[PDB]
Design a protein around this ligand. Structure first.
Ligand SMILES: Nc1ncnc2c1ncn2[C@@H]1O[C@H](COP(=O)(O)OP(=O)(O)OP(=O)(O)O)[C@@H](O)[C@H]1O
Ligand SMILES: Nc1ncnc2c1ncn2[C@@H]1O[C@H](COP(=O)(O)OP(=O)(O)OP(=O)(O)O)[C@@H](O)[C@H]1O
Ligand SMILES: Nc1ncnc2c1ncn2[C@@H]1O[C@H](COP(=O)(O)OP(=O)(O)OP(=O)(O)O)[C@@H](O)[C@H]1O
Ligand SMILES: Nc1ncnc2c1ncn2[C@@H]1O[C@H](COP(=O)(O)OP(=O)(O)OP(=O)(O)O)[C@@H](O)[C@H]1O
Lengths: 319, 319, 319, 319, 319
């Protein structure tokens, strides 16, 4: 009956996100201000009810959701459109009803629905079975507790706003475009993703990277980072020739991979090698270079045109 | 649901696996090096989640998975990807859901997904809806423990690696080719497959057997062995004439199958024969030779060349 | 607390089953050889037990079950999965355990389950919970049968192997395809069907009608045979003129129905003639020609395709 | 426990069924003749066990069943496929087994199952569990006693033969196709439906009608006959004016409705006239013409395509 | 067990139904004539057993039924598909059996099924589960008693004749198309609604209206009536100025709404005036004109093409 939804804390702060600080402000006003100063909502001043996040896949929509949850200071519900599709062919939406009941009983709460362009795909003919009933279930259940006493905020997520119907479109409120990161945002993400490795230095390299990598997502950036972090491990694996670097003041001679031609090149493998005596290769520009060679652009520009078209049409507001 | 997904703690060492040295080294550098130097994985440096075992069918990929499961020293969970349409579609996804949480509940552990290619291809329609949602679901489930929370290992198995989608391909790490067994491996299989039967002379005959088997799989070899074991039995059934051999010093005069022209060839049926008067044929080279002749080759060479084409394309890389 | 489930003495010999000598051999090795010489199954040659008969309907699978039951002289227990599903509202599975107990007490013993696919899957309305535990019970009994020393044999029968629960298949051992009879098997079956009936000229006819029936089952043959048998009876039913056959050396004058153009043609109704003094027309090829005419092609090829698929996918490997 | 089915029947004779004397022969030979002369079926010639009656609705399959039931004078049991299904979800088979027992009890019995396709096919829910198990039990029973020693005949009925489960198909004997009635049959039906009413001119009119009537069923024919038989009633109801028929031989006056200009046309209401003293108009051909005009062909051509497909594939078939 | 169907009736007479006197005749000849004069219907002449009413919705088929059972005044059953509902797998059919038993118990009995298509059709999916067996039960129950010995008439109502199961179609008797009303019928329907309101002038108005309202339904006509009825009430609602009509010969002074310029036009509200001492404006042509304007033709004419096609196949149909 219940179907358990996790409300635990994905500890991702505001500062861990880059860009669209204006949407961030809208969110601060939508949750934080209500939390902080509820008595400001007497008379005709009333909380925002629904926000859709729309844009290409891989743009930290989920990441944003995590940050929201961390920052909400209240009950947070998260669900994928995968969940609660069908059981018997007859019974689906009762679970939706019960979910909303649960949320209403926990004020303040926030519901996050991922991939709202699934359920509600939408395509005709085949909709008339259970799916139209679902579509209806959304529309009616958003009408229920909406007036007067609200402690629910609805966050949707979508890749394809243009296939989301008129009926949802001007009932469900506030829509915000989540673009791919620009040079600045990319650079900042690079700087965020470092770890303990001393790596290659300055901001010059970072800005070089964020410039050179363009049309890529946060996810893609993450991938590149992981790649580069593994590249020294890859060096360690493939070269069995190693060599001493550090002085004898340490525990012992500290060994790093080198070419077979190198002076001091001992060729035993990783297997014999003690924990202390380890010298990982530094993280160089070349790791990022090879990563870029391996990095292919994801999304066709037609999708950009459709997102841009929706934006020209509906944009930074619900409608 | 429940035993459709397996759980076990296998006890198969590296040395119990015929061959396979390059693959073994890959696994030791993919798992044991991490185990050797765990302090090297602070921050955004992470142990490998996904590895693919690829090659022709019948090569003990499952046995190999038991060996890595033993060496990594955790619980081995496993399922076949196509399983199961059975009656409901919906509850396959339910099984998919639970699985990841249940795996997280035993850190460390190993999930083995057999025939990963069965959920990805050029079919369309059914692939675009039902196997898409489970695919992207799998992708997201594997991603969720990505931030240094993981004790699970994902091992995949495929016969047709070249039908694997970019989406899986990129969200994933190491691929290892599992070739058909070579001389030494086949020979060792022949050594393992004996039992209490006295069998034939020395290791030289085993070497001969391993040599005469070309192109066969583990499975095929085992089948061949079973056939040769049954060959005396087959003789017992379809012989009419049995040769007398032993005198009254034994339980009684002992009869064994022989050709119609033989000295001491009495003609009655095996149904007339009891244990005292029985002489089962021994295991000769000829049993094994006719076993090998009556087992057809396994895999066409085009498939081998496509496996090797995949190797040339993707091989031992992250991608 | 007995509750007796069908046991009886069929009288079908090996020789009454025409063809499938390879399976027959396999079955003699599956049942009789184990019982005759158990000590032959020390080592890695193993007492195989769970055996599936699979293929199209009408091919004497049940007939074969009767034959081995006649021939093997081992206690043959024969049951539908439908039988003894429950009383309540509560308690099942006790009868299952009792059945397994009685079979263990009646070694050597054989359980024959027709239409094993009747137990399968993950549906609701009973199968999710109530028959799940029945299923489980089954699985645990058939697990324990392989444990320790076995005197029980499981024979499966199914027309729809692709609808057979996988978990069974994973637990289950040897699979044998029962094809439609080939030229020879059809021919022999004809000859079997004749028996005492006047046999007309030679084997040429039997081979011809053998060839001319393509793709038909045992059942399909049998109906045609019965039709032909009824043809002389039809010839008696339509009767005016009869004529004496037997000379004065015999016990009495013996009369058969004839055309009005016959010489010595006496006219009455078949009812007017006494039973002994009636001479039924012989069986001609035309009767069989008409029996063919009464049987239009009986083959749904999709089934054949599916059986081929299953045969290629499951049965080759042990599973 | 018993659930009472009645076997005492009305008097529908062979002669009330128009056409397919060959099917009649098959019925007589499968039922009456065996009972009459049991010694005919010693040795290898054995009575029919199964007959399927199929075709379009309205063709006296039920009528035929009543006719056989009249003529056979043995325990004739007849049942709907829906009848005796279950109560508490899974208690179904007891009544089935008991029924087959009951057939055994009173040999030679006849079982008629209407609309056998209602207990047939494959998909789920019922064909996963209940209708599955029930179908299975049916199958085991039907050939269970059928081959070897029998005293039951099973008659099936179906309008949709093409949906009949393959397995059931192969388990079942003798298909008889019921084609729509031809000129002769329709004529005979008209003659049957003459009643007491004076039959205007000869049988030539019925021949004409039989020719005129194309594609109609027994039911259709009966309805048109009824329609024509109401026409005199209708006429009576319409008239004011009636006239005396009664000649001097009759006891009292006898009045028939007539036109206003008639000799002795008195204009009171039909309600005022007593039943004996009223003379209904005789039936002329015009009433039957009207009847025909009113009732359009009942039969769509598109069913016959599938029926004809089945006919080409199986048809006048043994199986 | 027995459910609950109500039998008490309205007061709707034959004269309240404008249309199809021939259908009326069929009704009264198939119901009332049998009851009035049973001795007419001995031997081979038997009343109608099945009547289908088919056509567009809202044409007083149910209204017709009310008239029928008001007049005939015999045990009337009316039934919804909801009544006789399935939960425990086979309840419905049992309920059907019980129902027809009860019908037999209570002859003469009349059974009305609303929207018979609800319990109809042939394809699969949910048909194969409960609904096919339900249909089967229905059919067996109806035509087994229906032909020969009856005390029951089945009246069918459907908006979709074209999706009616062939088998049902043929086992059902007498079909009557219920068309949209023509001029005369429309006029009569207008005349039905007169009431205490002054009729205004002549029949010329009624026939004018009848002419002007081509393509309206019974329902539409009813609606337009209500509209025109409420028009003076609406006027009274917006009324300010009133004036006296009834002189001192009546019980009291009686005020009616008037224009502001009127002789003694006093301007208070309708609410101020007592119910008896109010005079209401009469019904003028304009009120009906506005009512017509307000209600557009409801039925698109290309929708009736399937009723007309069905009409071309079956029509004013005896079956
Ligand atoms: N500022 C940022 N902008 C975009 N992505 C980021 C940012 N910071 C972190 N990420 C990345 O976001 C990823 C989380 O998944 P993400 O939210 O990109 O999927 P998604 O946009 O919801 O796509 P889908 O809707 O298809 O699931 C993490 O891998 C993380 O590295
Ligand atoms: N030698 C034979 N081979 C095959 N069938 C035979 C033979 N002799 C007789 N038959 C016929 O086969 C039928 C016996 O049932 P059979 O074993 O064919 O069913 P089955 O193949 O088990 O089908 P299902 O699995 O659907 O029950 C009888 O109708 C019998 O007349
Ligand atoms: N001689 C006859 N031949 C065929 N039908 C007849 C004959 N006499 C009467 N009938 C009709 O047979 C009908 C009885 O149902 P019938 O047996 O035709 O259905 P069915 O053939 O079993 O097929 P279904 O049940 O699908 O309609 C009655 O309507 C009756 O008018
Ligand atoms: N003489 C008449 N002719 C047609 N309609 C009438 C007549 N008298 C009343 N009505 C109206 O017809 C309506 C009833 O419609 P109807 O009986 O066709 O519905 P139904 O038969 O129950 O359902 P459906 O028409 O969908 O099968 C009522 O609203 C009633 O006011």
């Amino acid at each position: 009956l219940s179907s358990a939804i996790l409300s635990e804390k994905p500890n991702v702060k505001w500062e861990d996100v880059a860009g669209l600080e204006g949407a961030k402000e809208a969110l601060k006003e939508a949750v934080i201000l209500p939390v902080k100063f509820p008595h400001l909502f007497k008379g005709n001043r009333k909380p925002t009810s629904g926000i859709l996040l729309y844009g290409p896949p891989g743009t930290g929509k989920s990441y944003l959701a995590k940050a929201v949850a961390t920052e909400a200071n209240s009950t947070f519900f998260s669900v994928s459109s995968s969940d609660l599709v069908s059981k018997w062919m007859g019974e689906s939406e009762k679970l939706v009803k019960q979910l909303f009941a649960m949320a209403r009983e926990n004020k303040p709460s926030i519901i996050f629905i991922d991939q709202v362009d699934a359920l509600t795909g939408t395509r005709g003919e085949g909709e008339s079975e259970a799916s139209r009933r679902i579509k209806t279930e959304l529309l009616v259940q958003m009408n229920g507790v909406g007036n007067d006493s609200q402690g629910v905020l609805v966050l949707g997520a979508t890749n394809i706003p243009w296939q989301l119907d008129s009926a949802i479109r001007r009932r469900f409120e506030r829509r915000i475009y989540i673009p791919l990161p620009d040079l600045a945002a990319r650079t900042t993400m690079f700087e965020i993703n470092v770890g303990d490795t001393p790596c290659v230095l300055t901001k010059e390299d970072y800005r070089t990277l964020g410039a050179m990598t363009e049309g890529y997502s946060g996810s893609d950036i993450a991938v590149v980072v992981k790649d580069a972090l593994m590249q020294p491990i890859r060096k360690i694996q493939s070269a069995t020739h190693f060599k001493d670097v550090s002085t004898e003041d340490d525990e012992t001679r500290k060994l790093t991979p080198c070419s077979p031609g190198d002076d001091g090149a001992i060729e035993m493998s990783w297997t014999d090698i003690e924990a202390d005596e380890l010298k990982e290769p530094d993280l160089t520009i070349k790791d990022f270079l090879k990563a870029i060679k391996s990095t292919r652009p994801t999304v066709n520009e037609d999708d950009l045109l459709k997102q841009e078209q929706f934006t020209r049409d509906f944009g930074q507001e619900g409608n």
